[PDB]
Amino acid sequence: LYFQGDILIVNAKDVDEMLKQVEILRRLGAKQIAVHSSDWRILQEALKKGGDILIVNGGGMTITFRGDDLEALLKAAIEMIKQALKFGATITLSLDGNDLNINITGVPEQVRKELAKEAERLAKEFGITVTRTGGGDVDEMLKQVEILRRLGAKQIAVESDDWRILQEALKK
Amino acid sequence: GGWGGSGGENLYFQGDILIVNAKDVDEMLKQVEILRRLGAKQIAVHSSDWRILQEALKKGGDILIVNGGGMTITFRGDDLEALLKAAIEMIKQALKFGATITLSLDGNDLNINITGVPEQVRKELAKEAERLAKEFGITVTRTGGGDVDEMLKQVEILRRLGAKQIAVESDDWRILQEAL
Numbered sequence: 542l543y544f545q546g547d548i549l550i551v552n553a554k555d556v557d558e559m560l561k562q563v564e565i566l567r568r569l570g571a572k573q574i575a576v577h578s579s580d581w582r583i584l585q586e587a588l589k590k591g592g593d594i595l596i597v598n599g600g601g602m603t604i605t606f607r608g609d610d611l612e613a614l615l616k617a618a619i620e621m622i623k624q625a626l627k628f629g630a631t632i633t634l635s636l637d638g639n640d641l642n643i644n645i646t647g648v649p650e651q652v653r654k655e656l657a658k659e660a661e662r663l664a665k666e667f668g669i670t671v672t673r674t675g676g677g678d679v680d681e682m683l684k685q686v687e688i689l690r691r692l693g694a695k696q697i698a699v700e701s702d703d704w705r706i707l708q709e710a711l712k713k
Numbered sequence: 714g715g716w717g718g719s720g721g722e723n724l725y726f727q728g729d730i731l732i733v734n735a736k737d738v739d740e741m742l743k744q745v746e747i748l749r750r751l752g753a754k755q756i757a758v759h760s761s762d763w764r765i766l767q768e769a770l771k772k773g774g775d776i777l778i779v780n781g782g783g784m785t786i787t788f789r790g791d792d793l794e795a796l797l798k799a800a801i802e803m804i805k806q807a808l809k810f811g812a813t814i815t816l817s818l819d820g821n822d823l824n825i826n827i828t829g830v831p832e833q834v835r836k837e838l839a840k841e842a843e844r845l846a847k848e849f850g851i852t853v854t855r856t857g858g859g860d861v862d863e864m865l866k867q868v869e870i871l872r873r874l875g876a877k878q879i880a881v882e883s884d885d886w887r888i889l890q891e892a893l
Contacts (some may be wrong), residue, residue, distance in 0.1 A: 542868070542893060548880035550778065552813075562886050569890070577882065596732065611808065615801045622816065623797055626823075631736060632816040636808045646734070679717065687722040698730035700759060704744040708751070711717035711724065 548594060550575040553583050554637060563591050575698070579603055579644060579676075581685050588694050595694050599682060599701040600710065601646040602653045604660045605673035607639060614641040617667035621659045628652045631702045640672065647702035649709075653677050679710035716751070730776060732757040735765050736817040736824065742772055749773050757880070761785055761815070761826045763867045770876045777876050779868060781883035782892075783828035784835045784859030786842045789821055790851040796823040799849045803841045810834045813884065822854065829884050835859050861892040 542549070549571045553559030559576060566574045575594035576587035584595045604621070606614045618641060622632050625645050630652075633644040645656060657674045664671045686697055701707045715723030724731070731753050735741030741758055748756050757776035758769035762785070766777045786803075788796045800823060804814050807827050812834075815826040827838060839856050846853045868879055883889045 542865070542879075542881060546878075548776070548778075548878065549886070550880055550882040551886065552882050552884040554884070565886050565890065575880065594730070596730075611805055615805055619794075619797050619801060623793055626793065626797075626816060626818040629818075631734070634804065634808065634814040634816070636811075641808075683717050683722045683724075686724070687720070690721040696730065697724075697728075698732055698757065699724060700732035700734050700757075702734045702736070703740075704731070704733060704747055708747060 544569055544571045546573075548573040548575050550577050550594075550596065551587075551592075553578045553587070554580070554635065554642075556580075556583050556586050559583050559587060560590055563587065567591050577700070581688075584689060585692060588689060588692055594696040594698055595689055596698045596700055597682065597686060597689075598644075598646065599699045599707050600677045600679060601644055601702075602657070602675050602677040603673055604643045604645070604657065604671060605637075606641045606643070606660075606664065606669050607672045608669040609639060611636070611641065613667060614669060617663045617669055618643055621656055621663055624659060625652075625656055628656075629703075642673075647706070649706050650677070679707070726752045727754045730755045730757050732759050732776075732778065733769075733774070734759045735769075736760075736762075737819055738762075738765050738768055741765050741769060745769065745773050759882070761828075763870075766871055766876075767874060770871060770874055775877040776880055777871055777878070778880040778882055779864060779871075780826075780828050781881050781886075781889045782859050782861055782864060783826060784839070784857060785855055786825045786827065786839065786853060787855040788823045788825070788842075788846060788851050789854050790823075791821060793818070793823065795849060796851060799845045799851055800825055802845055803838055806841060807834075807838055810838075812838075827859070831888075832860055861889070865893075
């Protein structure tokens with residue numbers, strides 16, 4: 542890899558870990574550091590601390606299930622993941638402590654609404670807690686992008702798993 | 714001239730990087746084509762599948778985004794609930810080892826991309842996948858790999874095929890630097 546020519550992207554789920562990773566790349570002389578995150582706060586912090594490129598998720602929803610037993614969180618999530626996959630979604634799973642984060646992309650608003658209703662009902666049936674839902678709205682995305690630009694972002698990038706869906710939300 | 718709004722509450726076809734995250738070659742090509750026809754000037758393609766990135770550089774993907782390490786396991790079967798029931802036991806282990814897992818469906822294939830874990834963990838997850846498939850009567854059609862050495866070889870192939878810009882994504886550069 543070329544520290545001068547290649548873009549090195551930090552995929553960040555926590556602000557402090559993000560800052561440490563950007564610092565490592567800076568101290569290695571990386572000239573093009575990007576930060577990719579679903580958390581606008583992380584992208585806002587990166588902008589101030591040497592993130593040259595801020596990578597935003599376009600139109601993705603995140604559902605977070607919280608509970609003490611990971612097997613039960615996953616058991617509860619399986620039916621919703623099954624439906625999401627059948628609707629054409631891409632699903633990303635990660636663990637933040639006792640939280641199971643389920644990011645769902647590649648689906649339109651009415652499908653995101655259905656999946657959030659499913660998550661709510663599954664959490665009740667399985668006795669777990671939903672601590673985050675939704676978040677794919679395009680208007681919110683553009684507002685947040687504008688905040689990044691006005692704070693001084695050097696370069697914005699937007700990632701989507703289905704620009705056919707995203708162009709329909711942006712056409713108006 | 715902005716997309717979605719004005720004053721910066723919009724995307725910029727020339728100034729912003731627009732990234733296609735593609736799980737299938739045809740879907741990538743269609744989305745790249747749409748972005749080109751809208752006049753997008755900085756189109757990137759992100760994929761865990763090298764074939765997708767090799768095709769993208771030919772069709773207007775100026776930035777190719779690769780994962781730093783990562784393995785894809787593909788399970789094949791007619792009943793998705795059974796594919797997912799089998800996969801969750803391995804996904805649980807992957808998650809406890811710190812992985813990020815991406816799931817997508819390509820027809821009768823459940824593609825499970827696992828990133829963020831070292832080779833010995835990938836070996837263990839592949840062994841688990843084999844055992845789960847055998848016990849549950851499903852077929853694994855792709856497994857293993859994901860090492861940084863292979864990533865570097867594949868990046869060099871992309872460069873030699875004409876990639877204009879490479880980007881590499883990781884959730885832990887503190888570790889990845891040791892492999893590089």
